[PDB]
Ligand binder design. Structure first.
Ligand code: A1BFM
Length: 185
């Protein structure tokens, strides 16, 4: 793909983070702590899941960023509406304001309703995410496999400002402690 020139510098918004997350000083990395991180509660924080938003809000244009997922067993990545539900249980679907893919139990799926099986021959260590606001498109690329397409959501109805979306996953297995990292331009 040739989306690299729409690169944006994403940073994580501490105030949205689940209270078990540890965000690095540079706000470019996040990992599961395996305990409460000694922060106050607020209405922005995702309560049920180890999720956080990027600080940046997008309402126009084309945006691209990359995320490192090396050695993780489970994660969700994509974009979401600024107005998504923060408290209680919910599914990742466009109807709920999310445009995501995930890894879970050695398989990759797109967050449609119901979910869609992805076909990945080379397990990715870094994922590229492209958003074209006007076109209603969110696309995912396998940087480890020369930038091959993973999935395209089209006819998206964003219905509001968009924010980068991250889930580091639980670490019940002791095999999923590795961070999500925003990769340099
Ligand atoms: C995501 C965070 O808010 C959360 C949800 N559940 N848990 C732990 C309670 C027992 C082990 C897992 C932590």
């Amino acid at each position: 793909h040739h989306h690299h020139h729409h690169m944006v510098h994403i940073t994580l918004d501490r105030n949205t983070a689940n209270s078990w997350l540890i965000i690095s000083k540079d706000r470019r990395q996040v990992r599961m702590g395996d305990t409460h991180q000694n922060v106050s509660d607020n209405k922005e924080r995702f309560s049920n899941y180890p999720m956080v938003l990027g600080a940046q809000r997008f309402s126009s244009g084309k945006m691209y960023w990359e995320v490192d997922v090396t050695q993780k067993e489970a994660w969700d990545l994509g974009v979401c509406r600024d107005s998504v539900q923060r408290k209680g249980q919910f599914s990742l679907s466009p109807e709920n304001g999310f445009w995501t893919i995930w890894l879970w139990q050695d398989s990759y799926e797109a967050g449609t309703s119901p979910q869609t099986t992805l076909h990945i021959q080379v397990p990715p260590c870094q994922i590229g995410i492209f958003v074209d606001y006007e076109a209603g498109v969110v696309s995912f690329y396998n940087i480890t496999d020369h930038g091959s397409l993973i999935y395209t959501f089209s006819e998206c109805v964003f219905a509001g400002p968009l924010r980068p979306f991250f889930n580091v996953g639980f670490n019940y297995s002791g095999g999923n402690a590795a961070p999500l990292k925003l990769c340099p331009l």
